[PDB]
Protein backbone atom coordinates (compact mmCIF):
# COMPACT_ATOMS: atom_id res chain seq x y z
CA UNK A 1 0.00 0.00 0.00
CA UNK A 2 2.35 2.72 -1.24
CA UNK A 3 1.16 6.29 -0.83
CA UNK A 4 -0.28 8.02 -3.94
CA UNK A 5 2.62 10.41 -4.43
CA UNK A 6 3.04 9.68 -8.14
CA UNK A 7 -0.42 10.86 -9.20
CA UNK A 8 -0.05 14.09 -7.21
CA UNK A 9 3.52 14.68 -8.45
CA UNK A 10 3.48 13.23 -11.98
CA UNK A 11 0.17 14.90 -12.84
CA UNK A 12 0.17 16.43 -16.31
CA UNK A 13 -1.69 19.61 -15.30
CA UNK A 14 -1.50 21.42 -11.97
CA UNK A 15 -4.10 23.75 -10.52
CA UNK A 16 -3.90 27.50 -10.73
CA UNK A 17 -2.46 29.04 -7.59
CA UNK A 18 -5.72 30.71 -6.53
CA UNK A 19 -7.81 27.53 -6.96
CA UNK A 20 -5.19 25.16 -5.56
CA UNK A 21 -5.96 21.47 -5.17
CA UNK A 22 -6.19 19.69 -1.83
CA UNK A 23 -5.52 15.97 -1.43
CA UNK A 24 -5.63 13.73 1.65
CA UNK A 25 -2.97 11.06 2.17
CA UNK A 26 -3.92 8.32 4.61
CA UNK A 27 -3.52 4.58 5.24
CA UNK A 28 -0.36 4.05 3.21
CA UNK A 29 3.41 3.84 3.45
CA UNK A 30 5.17 6.98 2.21
CA UNK A 31 8.59 6.76 0.57
CA UNK A 32 10.83 9.74 -0.17
CA UNK A 33 13.58 8.21 -2.30
CA UNK A 34 11.22 8.19 -5.29
CA UNK A 35 10.84 11.97 -5.16
CA UNK A 36 14.01 12.36 -7.26
CA UNK A 37 12.97 10.74 -10.56
CA UNK A 38 9.43 12.16 -10.61
CA UNK A 39 10.58 15.70 -9.67
CA UNK A 40 13.87 16.94 -11.17
CA UNK A 41 15.54 20.05 -9.73
CA UNK A 42 13.43 19.76 -6.60
CA UNK A 43 14.05 22.00 -3.60
CA UNK A 44 12.90 20.53 -0.31
CA UNK A 45 13.68 23.36 2.08
CA UNK A 46 11.00 22.82 4.67
CA UNK A 47 9.71 23.45 8.17
CA UNK A 48 8.65 21.62 11.30
CA UNK A 49 10.64 18.39 10.87
CA UNK A 50 14.18 17.39 9.93
CA UNK A 51 14.22 16.11 6.32
CA UNK A 52 17.01 13.59 6.97
CA UNK A 53 15.00 11.61 9.55
CA UNK A 54 11.68 11.60 7.65
CA UNK A 55 12.29 7.93 6.86
CA UNK A 56 11.74 6.63 10.41
CA UNK A 57 8.65 8.52 11.54
CA UNK A 58 4.86 8.22 11.41
CA UNK A 59 2.46 10.98 10.36
CA UNK A 60 -1.13 11.09 11.60
CA UNK A 61 -2.65 12.97 8.66
CA UNK A 62 -1.07 14.44 5.53
CA UNK A 63 -2.45 17.07 3.16
CA UNK A 64 -0.93 17.68 -0.27
CA UNK A 65 -1.57 21.01 -2.01
CA UNK A 66 -0.27 21.54 -5.54
CA UNK A 67 -0.13 24.56 -7.84
CA UNK A 68 2.05 26.44 -10.34
CA UNK A 69 3.71 29.81 -9.69
CA UNK A 70 6.56 31.94 -10.97
CA UNK A 71 10.19 31.18 -10.24
CA UNK A 72 10.93 34.29 -8.19
CA UNK A 73 7.73 33.97 -6.15
CA UNK A 74 8.63 30.57 -4.70
CA UNK A 75 10.12 32.33 -1.66
CA UNK A 76 6.60 33.57 -0.84
CA UNK A 77 5.49 30.03 0.08
CA UNK A 78 6.78 30.04 3.66
CA UNK A 79 5.31 30.84 7.09
CA UNK A 80 5.18 34.53 7.93
CA UNK A 81 6.01 35.72 4.41
CA UNK A 82 4.25 38.73 2.92
CA UNK A 83 3.50 39.27 -0.75
CA UNK A 84 0.98 38.87 -3.52
CA UNK A 85 0.82 35.06 -3.44
CA UNK A 86 0.90 34.88 0.35
CA UNK A 87 -1.84 37.48 0.83
CA UNK A 88 -4.31 36.85 -1.99
CA UNK A 89 -3.74 33.26 -3.16
CA UNK A 90 -2.21 30.95 -0.54
CA UNK A 91 -1.51 31.86 3.09
CA UNK A 92 0.31 29.48 5.41
CA UNK A 93 -0.15 29.43 9.19
CA UNK A 94 2.70 30.81 11.26
CA UNK A 95 3.08 27.58 13.27
CA UNK A 96 3.21 25.52 10.09
CA UNK A 97 4.31 21.89 10.08
CA UNK A 98 5.18 19.93 6.96
CA UNK A 99 7.52 20.30 4.04
CA UNK A 100 7.31 22.24 0.78
CA UNK A 101 8.81 21.11 -2.53
CA UNK A 102 9.24 23.19 -5.67
CA UNK A 103 10.68 22.15 -9.02
CA UNK A 104 11.19 23.88 -12.34
CA UNK A 105 8.73 22.82 -15.03
CA UNK A 106 9.69 24.92 -18.04
CA UNK A 107 9.73 21.83 -20.27
CA UNK A 108 6.20 20.90 -19.15
CA UNK A 109 4.29 24.17 -18.74
CA UNK A 110 5.68 26.55 -21.38
CA UNK A 111 4.10 26.97 -24.81
CA UNK A 112 5.40 28.67 -27.94
CA UNK A 113 2.22 30.71 -28.38
CA UNK A 114 2.13 31.62 -24.69
CA UNK A 115 0.59 30.06 -21.59
CA UNK A 116 -2.67 31.89 -20.81
CA UNK A 117 -4.34 29.15 -18.75
CA UNK A 118 -2.61 29.66 -15.38
CA UNK A 119 -4.28 32.42 -13.38
CA UNK A 120 -3.58 34.22 -10.12
CA UNK A 121 -5.66 36.59 -8.02
CA UNK A 122 -4.36 40.16 -8.06
CA UNK A 123 -7.02 42.27 -6.30
CA UNK A 124 -8.66 41.44 -2.99
CA UNK A 125 -10.34 43.34 -0.17
CA UNK A 126 -8.26 41.81 2.63
CA UNK A 127 -5.53 39.26 3.17
CA UNK A 128 -6.40 35.57 3.33
CA UNK A 129 -6.41 33.82 6.67
CA UNK A 130 -4.30 30.63 6.66
CA UNK A 131 -5.67 27.84 4.45
CA UNK A 132 -8.58 29.56 2.64
CA UNK A 133 -9.36 29.53 -1.13
CA UNK A 134 -11.21 32.51 -2.74
CA UNK A 135 -12.86 31.31 -5.95
CA UNK A 136 -14.96 34.46 -6.33
CA UNK A 137 -14.79 36.29 -9.66
CA UNK A 138 -16.61 39.46 -8.58
CA UNK A 139 -15.42 42.62 -10.31
CA UNK A 140 -13.11 44.74 -8.17
CA UNK A 141 -14.10 48.32 -7.34
CA UNK A 142 -10.90 50.36 -6.98
CA UNK A 143 -12.51 53.81 -7.15
CA UNK A 144 -15.65 55.55 -5.90
CA UNK A 145 -18.31 54.92 -8.54
CA UNK A 146 -19.69 51.36 -8.41
CA UNK A 147 -18.55 49.05 -11.19
CA UNK A 148 -21.96 47.40 -11.73
CA UNK A 149 -20.27 44.66 -13.76
CA UNK A 150 -18.39 47.06 -16.04
CA UNK A 151 -14.62 46.59 -16.34
CA UNK A 152 -13.58 50.17 -17.12
CA UNK A 153 -11.01 52.30 -15.32
CA UNK A 154 -10.93 51.79 -11.53
CA UNK A 155 -12.80 48.53 -12.23
CA UNK A 156 -10.41 45.63 -12.76
CA UNK A 157 -10.95 41.90 -13.09
CA UNK A 158 -9.51 40.32 -9.91
CA UNK A 159 -7.74 37.46 -11.74
CA UNK A 160 -4.79 37.90 -14.09
CA UNK A 161 -2.96 35.37 -16.26
CA UNK A 162 0.66 34.31 -15.91
CA UNK A 163 2.71 35.72 -18.78
CA UNK A 164 5.57 33.24 -18.62
CA UNK A 165 8.68 34.50 -20.43
CA UNK A 166 11.24 31.66 -20.55
CA UNK A 167 13.62 33.90 -22.51
CA UNK A 168 14.32 35.78 -19.27
CA UNK A 169 15.77 34.20 -16.14
CA UNK A 170 14.36 31.45 -13.98
CA UNK A 171 12.35 34.13 -12.19
CA UNK A 172 10.09 34.22 -15.25
CA UNK A 173 9.54 30.48 -15.54
CA UNK A 174 6.76 28.20 -14.26
CA UNK A 175 7.69 26.31 -11.09
CA UNK A 176 5.43 23.55 -9.79
CA UNK A 177 4.96 23.65 -6.02
CA UNK A 178 3.68 20.84 -3.79
CA UNK A 179 3.17 21.50 -0.07
CA UNK A 180 2.81 18.66 2.43
CA UNK A 181 1.06 19.53 5.69
CA UNK A 182 1.85 17.06 8.46
CA UNK A 183 0.57 16.96 12.04
CA UNK A 184 0.53 14.90 15.23
CA UNK A 185 -2.78 14.38 17.02
CA UNK A 186 -4.74 12.06 19.31
CA UNK A 187 -5.37 9.64 16.44
CA UNK A 188 -2.98 6.67 16.19
CA UNK A 189 -0.34 6.74 13.49
CA UNK A 190 -1.51 5.73 10.03
CA UNK A 191 1.02 7.20 7.54
CA UNK A 192 4.58 6.00 8.11
CA UNK A 193 7.83 5.78 6.21
CA UNK A 194 9.59 2.68 4.89
Amino acid at each position, epitope marked *: NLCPFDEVFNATRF*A*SVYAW*NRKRISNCVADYSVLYNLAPFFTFKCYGVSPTKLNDLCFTNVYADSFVIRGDEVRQIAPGQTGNIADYNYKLPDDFTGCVIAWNSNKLDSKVSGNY*NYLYRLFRKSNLKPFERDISTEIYQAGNKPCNGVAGFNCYFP*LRSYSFRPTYGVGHQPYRVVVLSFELLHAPATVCGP
Partner: antibody, heavy 122, light 111 residues
Framework: QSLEESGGDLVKPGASLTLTCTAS?????????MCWVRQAPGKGLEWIAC????????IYYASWAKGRFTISKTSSTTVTLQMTSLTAADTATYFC???????????????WGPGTLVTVSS | DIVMTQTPASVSEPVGGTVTIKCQAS??????LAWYQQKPGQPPKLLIY???TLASGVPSRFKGSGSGTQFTLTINGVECADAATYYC????????????FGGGTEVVVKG
Protein backbone atom coordinates in the same frame (compact mmCIF):
# COMPACT_ATOMS: atom_id res chain seq x y z
CA GLN B 1 -7.90 25.86 -42.84
CA SER B 2 -10.15 22.80 -42.64
CA LEU B 3 -10.22 19.15 -41.53
CA GLU B 4 -12.84 17.62 -43.83
CA GLU B 5 -13.35 13.96 -42.91
CA SER B 6 -14.01 11.02 -45.22
CA GLY B 7 -15.04 7.36 -45.10
CA GLY B 8 -18.60 7.69 -43.81
CA ASP B 9 -20.99 5.03 -45.09
CA LEU B 10 -23.41 2.32 -44.00
CA VAL B 11 -21.79 -0.74 -42.41
CA LYS B 12 -23.53 -3.98 -41.53
CA PRO B 13 -23.45 -5.05 -37.87
CA GLY B 14 -20.30 -6.87 -36.86
CA ALA B 15 -18.05 -5.16 -39.42
CA SER B 16 -15.21 -2.64 -39.42
CA LEU B 17 -14.61 0.84 -40.81
CA THR B 18 -11.62 3.16 -41.21
CA LEU B 19 -12.41 6.87 -41.32
CA THR B 20 -9.82 9.43 -42.38
CA CYS B 21 -9.21 13.03 -41.30
CA THR B 22 -7.31 15.17 -43.80
CA ALA B 23 -5.93 18.61 -43.01
CA SER B 24 -6.28 21.43 -45.52
CA UNK B 25 -4.07 24.51 -45.51
CA UNK B 26 -1.54 22.98 -43.09
CA UNK B 27 0.16 19.75 -42.09
CA UNK B 28 0.39 17.97 -38.74
CA UNK B 29 3.10 19.85 -36.90
CA UNK B 30 4.28 18.63 -33.51
CA UNK B 31 2.80 21.60 -31.66
CA UNK B 32 -0.84 20.48 -31.87
CA UNK B 33 -2.87 17.52 -30.64
CA MET B 34 -5.53 15.78 -32.72
CA CYS B 35 -8.69 14.14 -31.42
CA TRP B 36 -11.76 12.24 -32.60
CA VAL B 37 -15.20 12.62 -31.02
CA ARG B 38 -18.67 11.37 -31.91
CA GLN B 39 -22.27 12.46 -31.38
CA ALA B 40 -25.41 10.35 -31.43
CA PRO B 41 -28.34 11.71 -33.48
CA GLY B 42 -30.16 13.06 -30.42
CA LYS B 43 -27.67 12.74 -27.55
CA GLY B 44 -24.68 14.75 -26.36
CA LEU B 45 -21.06 14.78 -27.44
CA GLU B 46 -18.88 11.75 -26.72
CA TRP B 47 -15.09 11.74 -26.86
CA ILE B 48 -13.33 8.81 -28.55
CA ALA B 49 -9.59 9.29 -28.84
CA CYS B 50 -6.59 11.58 -29.25
CA UNK B 51 -3.19 11.29 -30.91
CA UNK B 52 -0.30 13.71 -30.64
CA UNK B 53 1.40 14.69 -33.88
CA UNK B 54 4.81 15.03 -32.21
CA UNK B 55 7.86 12.80 -32.09
CA UNK B 56 6.21 10.45 -29.56
CA UNK B 57 2.44 10.21 -29.91
CA UNK B 58 0.47 10.18 -26.65
CA ILE B 59 -2.40 8.05 -27.92
CA TYR B 60 -5.31 8.20 -25.47
CA TYR B 61 -8.59 6.32 -25.41
CA ALA B 62 -11.88 6.58 -23.58
CA SER B 63 -12.96 3.85 -21.17
CA TRP B 64 -15.99 2.83 -23.24
CA ALA B 65 -13.79 2.16 -26.30
CA LYS B 66 -10.72 0.62 -24.69
CA GLY B 67 -10.05 -2.03 -27.32
CA ARG B 68 -12.72 -1.60 -29.97
CA PHE B 69 -11.19 1.49 -31.61
CA THR B 70 -7.69 2.28 -32.88
CA ILE B 71 -6.34 5.67 -33.98
CA SER B 72 -3.14 6.12 -35.96
CA LYS B 73 -1.41 8.87 -37.92
CA THR B 74 -0.42 7.75 -41.42
CA SER B 75 1.04 10.79 -43.22
CA SER B 76 1.87 14.48 -42.81
CA THR B 77 -1.78 15.53 -43.28
CA THR B 78 -3.81 12.36 -42.66
CA VAL B 79 -4.89 10.68 -39.42
CA THR B 80 -7.10 7.59 -39.54
CA LEU B 81 -9.41 6.04 -36.96
CA GLN B 82 -10.50 2.44 -37.40
CA MET B 83 -13.22 0.65 -35.45
CA THR B 84 -14.17 -3.01 -35.49
CA SER B 85 -17.46 -4.77 -34.72
CA LEU B 86 -19.74 -1.76 -35.05
CA THR B 87 -23.06 -2.32 -33.27
CA ALA B 88 -26.47 -0.70 -33.66
CA ALA B 89 -25.53 2.03 -31.16
CA ASP B 90 -22.39 3.12 -33.05
CA THR B 91 -24.38 5.16 -35.59
CA ALA B 92 -23.42 8.79 -35.06
CA THR B 93 -21.71 11.81 -36.57
CA TYR B 94 -17.94 11.72 -36.09
CA PHE B 95 -15.88 14.91 -35.82
CA CYS B 96 -12.11 15.27 -36.13
CA UNK B 97 -11.16 18.15 -33.87
CA UNK B 98 -7.82 19.85 -33.26
CA UNK B 99 -6.45 20.77 -29.85
CA UNK B 100 -4.44 23.82 -28.81
CA UNK B 101 -1.96 22.41 -26.27
CA UNK B 102 0.04 19.17 -26.11
CA UNK B 103 -0.64 18.13 -22.53
CA UNK B 104 -1.13 14.44 -23.44
CA UNK B 105 -4.88 14.75 -23.80
CA UNK B 106 -7.77 16.69 -25.32
CA UNK B 107 -7.53 20.32 -24.30
CA UNK B 108 -9.76 23.09 -25.67
CA UNK B 109 -10.88 22.28 -29.22
CA UNK B 110 -10.27 25.49 -31.15
CA UNK B 111 -11.00 24.08 -34.61
CA TRP B 112 -13.61 21.52 -35.66
CA GLY B 113 -14.24 19.63 -38.86
CA PRO B 114 -17.65 19.27 -40.50
CA GLY B 115 -17.83 15.63 -39.41
CA THR B 116 -19.21 12.64 -41.30
CA LEU B 117 -22.22 10.41 -40.72
CA VAL B 118 -21.78 6.69 -39.97
CA THR B 119 -24.86 4.47 -39.77
CA VAL B 120 -25.11 0.80 -38.79
CA SER B 121 -28.13 -1.15 -40.02
CA SER B 122 -29.04 -4.33 -41.88
CA ASP C 1 -11.91 9.41 -12.70
CA ILE C 2 -13.61 12.81 -13.00
CA VAL C 3 -17.26 12.82 -14.11
CA MET C 4 -19.34 15.97 -14.59
CA THR C 5 -23.06 16.59 -14.83
CA GLN C 6 -24.77 19.53 -16.51
CA THR C 7 -28.10 21.01 -15.45
CA PRO C 8 -30.83 21.78 -16.32
CA ALA C 9 -31.56 19.47 -19.25
CA SER C 10 -33.56 22.24 -20.95
CA VAL C 11 -34.36 25.89 -20.23
CA SER C 12 -36.80 28.45 -21.63
CA GLU C 13 -37.31 32.18 -21.08
CA PRO C 14 -38.59 35.15 -23.10
CA VAL C 15 -36.16 37.16 -25.22
CA GLY C 16 -35.42 39.64 -22.43
CA GLY C 17 -34.17 37.26 -19.75
CA THR C 18 -30.85 35.81 -18.62
CA VAL C 19 -30.11 32.07 -18.58
CA THR C 20 -27.84 30.29 -16.10
CA ILE C 21 -26.42 26.81 -16.69
CA LYS C 22 -24.60 24.80 -14.02
CA CYS C 23 -21.89 22.18 -14.55
CA GLN C 24 -20.47 20.36 -11.50
CA ALA C 25 -17.56 17.88 -11.40
CA SER C 26 -16.98 14.91 -9.12
CA UNK C 27 -13.63 16.31 -7.94
CA UNK C 28 -11.94 19.69 -8.07
CA UNK C 29 -10.74 20.53 -11.58
CA UNK C 30 -9.43 24.02 -10.69
CA UNK C 31 -9.57 26.35 -13.72
CA UNK C 32 -9.59 23.80 -16.57
CA LEU C 33 -13.01 23.96 -18.23
CA ALA C 34 -14.52 24.88 -21.58
CA TRP C 35 -18.04 25.91 -22.59
CA TYR C 36 -18.95 24.94 -26.17
CA GLN C 37 -21.99 25.90 -28.23
CA GLN C 38 -23.54 23.71 -30.94
CA LYS C 39 -26.39 24.81 -33.15
CA PRO C 40 -28.36 22.03 -34.88
CA GLY C 41 -26.60 20.61 -37.91
CA GLN C 42 -23.27 22.30 -37.14
CA PRO C 43 -20.02 21.43 -35.38
CA PRO C 44 -19.76 22.93 -31.90
CA LYS C 45 -18.09 26.31 -31.49
CA LEU C 46 -15.85 27.27 -28.57
CA LEU C 47 -17.36 29.93 -26.31
CA ILE C 48 -15.49 30.01 -22.98
CA TYR C 49 -12.03 28.65 -22.52
CA UNK C 50 -10.26 28.65 -19.14
CA UNK C 51 -13.74 29.06 -17.60
CA UNK C 52 -13.47 32.86 -17.69
CA THR C 53 -11.89 33.96 -20.96
CA LEU C 54 -14.15 34.70 -23.91
CA ALA C 55 -13.26 33.04 -27.20
CA SER C 56 -12.28 34.91 -30.36
CA GLY C 57 -15.18 36.57 -32.15
CA VAL C 58 -17.72 35.68 -29.43
CA PRO C 59 -20.21 38.39 -28.39
CA SER C 60 -19.77 39.84 -24.91
CA ARG C 61 -22.91 38.26 -23.48
CA PHE C 62 -21.59 34.90 -22.20
CA LYS C 63 -20.15 35.21 -18.69
CA GLY C 64 -18.46 32.26 -17.05
CA SER C 65 -18.20 32.07 -13.30
CA GLY C 66 -17.18 29.77 -10.48
CA SER C 67 -14.22 27.47 -9.97
CA GLY C 68 -13.27 24.26 -8.20
CA THR C 69 -16.26 21.92 -8.49
CA GLN C 70 -19.13 24.23 -9.52
CA PHE C 71 -19.21 26.30 -12.70
CA THR C 72 -21.93 28.50 -14.17
CA LEU C 73 -22.49 30.08 -17.56
CA THR C 74 -24.81 33.08 -17.80
CA ILE C 75 -26.29 34.73 -20.88
CA ASN C 76 -27.39 38.23 -19.88
CA GLY C 77 -29.40 38.72 -23.07
CA VAL C 78 -30.79 36.23 -25.55
CA GLU C 79 -31.74 37.30 -29.07
CA CYS C 80 -33.43 34.21 -30.62
CA ALA C 81 -30.04 33.39 -32.22
CA ASP C 82 -28.66 31.79 -29.04
CA ALA C 83 -31.11 28.87 -29.22
CA ALA C 84 -28.51 26.09 -29.25
CA THR C 85 -26.95 23.42 -27.04
CA TYR C 86 -24.20 24.13 -24.51
CA TYR C 87 -21.56 21.74 -23.19
CA CYS C 88 -18.85 21.76 -20.51
CA UNK C 89 -15.50 19.99 -20.93
CA UNK C 90 -13.11 19.25 -18.08
CA UNK C 91 -9.76 19.29 -20.00
CA UNK C 92 -8.03 18.51 -16.69
CA UNK C 93 -7.31 14.77 -16.38
CA UNK C 94 -8.18 12.58 -19.37
CA UNK C 95 -6.24 9.41 -18.56
CA UNK C 96 -9.15 7.08 -17.69
CA UNK C 97 -12.39 9.00 -18.27
CA UNK C 98 -15.51 7.76 -20.03
CA UNK C 99 -16.38 11.18 -21.47
CA UNK C 100 -14.78 14.59 -21.01
CA PHE C 101 -17.93 16.35 -22.20
CA GLY C 102 -20.91 16.74 -19.92
CA GLY C 103 -24.55 16.37 -20.77
CA GLY C 104 -26.32 18.60 -23.26
CA THR C 105 -28.38 21.63 -22.26
CA GLU C 106 -30.90 22.74 -24.89
CA VAL C 107 -31.88 26.42 -24.79
CA VAL C 108 -35.24 27.56 -26.20
CA VAL C 109 -35.78 31.28 -26.78
CA LYS C 110 -39.54 31.85 -27.09
CA GLY C 111 -39.57 35.24 -28.78
Amino acid sequence: QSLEESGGDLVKPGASLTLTCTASGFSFSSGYDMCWVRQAPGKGLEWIACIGTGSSGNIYYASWAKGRFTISKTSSTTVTLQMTSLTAADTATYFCARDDADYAGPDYFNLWGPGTLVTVSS
Amino acid sequence: DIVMTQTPASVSEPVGGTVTIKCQASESISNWLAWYQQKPGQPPKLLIYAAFTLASGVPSRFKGSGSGTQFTLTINGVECADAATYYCQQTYSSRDVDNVFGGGTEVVVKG
